Amino acid sequence: LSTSLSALPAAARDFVEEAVRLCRPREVLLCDGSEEEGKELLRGLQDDGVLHPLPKYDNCWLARTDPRDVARVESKTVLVTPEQSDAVPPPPPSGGPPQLGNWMSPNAFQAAVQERFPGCMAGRPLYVIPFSMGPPTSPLAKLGVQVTDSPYVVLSMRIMTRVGPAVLQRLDDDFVRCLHSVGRPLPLTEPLVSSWPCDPSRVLVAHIPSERRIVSFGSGYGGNSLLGKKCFALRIASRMAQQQGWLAEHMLILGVTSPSGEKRYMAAAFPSACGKTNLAMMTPSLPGWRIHCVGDDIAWMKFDDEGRLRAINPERGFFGVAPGTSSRTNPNAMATIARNTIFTNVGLRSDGGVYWDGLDEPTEPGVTYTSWLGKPWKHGDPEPCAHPNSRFCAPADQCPIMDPRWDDPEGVPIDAIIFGGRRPRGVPLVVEAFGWRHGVFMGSAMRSLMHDPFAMRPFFGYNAGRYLEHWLSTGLRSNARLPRLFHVNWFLRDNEGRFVWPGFGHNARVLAWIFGRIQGRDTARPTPIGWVPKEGDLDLGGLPGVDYSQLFPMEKGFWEEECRQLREYYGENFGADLPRDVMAELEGLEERVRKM
Numbered sequence: 001l002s003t004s005l006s007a008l009p010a011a012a013r014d015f016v017e018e019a020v021r022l023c024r025p026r027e028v029l030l031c032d033g034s035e036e037e038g039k040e041l042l043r044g045l046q047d048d049g050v051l052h053p054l055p056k057y058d059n060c061w062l063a064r065t066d067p068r069d070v071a072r073v074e075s076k077t078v079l080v081t082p083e084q085s086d087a088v089p090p091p092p093p094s095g096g097p098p099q100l101g102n103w104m105s106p107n108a109f110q111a112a113v114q115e116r117f118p119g120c121m122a123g124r125p126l127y128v129i130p131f132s133m134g135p136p137t138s139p140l141a142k143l144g145v146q147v148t149d150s151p152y153v154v155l156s157m158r159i160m161t162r163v164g165p166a167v168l169q170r171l172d173d174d175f176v177r178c179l180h181s182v183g184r185p186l187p188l189t190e191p192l193v194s195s196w197p198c199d200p201s202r203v204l205v206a207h208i209p210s211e212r213r214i215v216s217f218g219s220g221y222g223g224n225s226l227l228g229k230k231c232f233a234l235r236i237a238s239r240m241a242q243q244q245g246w247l248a249e250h251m252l253i254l255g256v257t258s259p260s261g262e263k264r265y266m267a268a269a270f271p272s273a274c275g276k277t278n279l280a281m282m283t284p285s286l287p288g289w290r291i292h293c294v295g296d297d298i299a300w301m302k303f304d305d306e307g308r309l310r311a312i313n314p315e316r317g318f319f320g321v322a323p324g325t326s327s328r329t330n331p332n333a334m335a336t337i338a339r340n341t342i343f344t345n346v347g348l349r350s351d352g353g354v355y356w357d358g359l360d361e362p363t364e365p366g367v368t369y370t371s372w373l374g375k376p377w378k379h380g381d382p383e384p385c386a387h388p389n390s391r392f393c394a395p396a397d398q399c400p401i402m403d404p405r406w407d408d409p410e411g412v413p414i415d416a417i418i419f420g421g422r423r424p425r426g427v428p429l430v431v432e433a434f435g436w437r438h439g440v441f442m443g444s445a446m447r448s449l450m451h452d453p454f455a456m457r458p459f460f461g462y463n464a465g466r467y468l469e470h471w472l473s474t475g476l477r478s479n480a481r482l483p484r485l486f487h488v489n490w491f492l493r494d495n496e497g498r499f500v501w502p503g504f505g506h507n508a509r510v511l512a513w514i515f516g517r518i519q520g521r522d523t524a525r526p527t528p529i530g531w532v533p534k535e536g537d538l539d540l541g542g543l544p545g546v547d548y549s550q551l552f553p554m555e556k557g558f559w560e561e562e563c564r565q566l567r568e569y570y571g572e573n574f575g576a577d578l579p580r581d582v583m584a585e586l587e588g589l590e591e592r593v594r595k596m
């Protein structure tokens, strides 16, 4: 933290001074990403009452939020473009709520800024955060400058991105301007809740791609405030990608090594509550196989000169949902979050540790709890101890299975892309697409019952139909080594309501099959929905009782209904903006189902 801004290049300096004149902060501080700066930020945050130390652990801290500021606010998140059709398809003609993004006109956007930002930082320091999305020297990396009046945001951006000097050395006119304020100028006219400033009634999270700009007001929380995380890495980036010939995706990236020494990388898009982080840092249950984590949320991908799809993880840390995390379910995540971690809205224990539903850290008898609301809590309370969207924010380099190339500037070659879902019936354990367009259809048809195409539903940066067109166009690249495309479902249930598939480390068996398919192996049989593993070619050795026929249902009734639902979904939500090739795939599936 320094008041000297002379190291900022001209365009970055211009942006900072614009924000200063608008927001009227008490002082202006340039962040350098150093260890000493982190200690300073922590001290101020503890003094402000925002952070509780967690003396059970090594340098971990707990923040709590105002109950009105606990998650991304989709209804207040908007794309700002001169033409509405550049941002979103036509409104559902039957009058249903728009579900592929919100549009705000430039006129309306500017008027909204003018109601909110003038003088919003009075009495507060403004912090300048120069940051890189990706290793700063990667050809796939992109820079930003975020200004904010939240030390909490500064601390978390330091973890989630690359911040400081090394970024400054690369900074020119080409960066994303990221303007943030909690919207609580001093003096306060009423007490805060949990020392957490916000302006919930006026929250606005705006994306202005034509201006390389993100503007976020009134929330201090994760997806709204850490502008690299979703605003930049998916919304702004997806539009850049469409214009510049790459892909910015809501995908984990992992490396899979066979017992015989070959390594393949795979990306996977999962909607919420499908075990995304459990897959990305899985400990495999097939002897000889290794899994490494490259990232568990965002993937930026571009074809190289040889036609290989190269991916980087543009983030430097994990901002993960805490509830459910345990040594039983994810020992790698437990190791990642054991030190130098900021927890938000989890429970606090009398022994100075944390608590959330599912946590299995041994604790002494007589240990007691305080909920994320600051109230005493005991098991059986109608409310959870930790908020369901409570988070850890931890450096990625603490994950024991980080891939050796997780921060390699060249990126890793992707040979499979996996779409995920959670269905009790109908959708097989694993299916491979018959080709590129068929796979793009599978991605567009993902569910979460809600539809979540490519797991991008809340994160489109431009017309979702045109994003599907971009995916189709991408497959036409001359001499591209296109990854094979798959859809997986870990969550089929049997007649008794128990899972047919044990999941977790056994998911490695599904990755092993996919690995073999990448290798050109003759291990599949055709079905109306795509290729499935032949019985015997999916390794079920050591899984006695697991019933192959239950893992690969082929139910005509289910698919007839699924087709009806998709047709209605496409018609209402994409209309004329749906690419013909996608509709053609639905029509093909319909005809194949007719003959089954």
Ligand SMILES: [Mn+2]
Pocket (backbone or CB within 6 Å): 250, 297
């Ligand atoms: Mn995500």
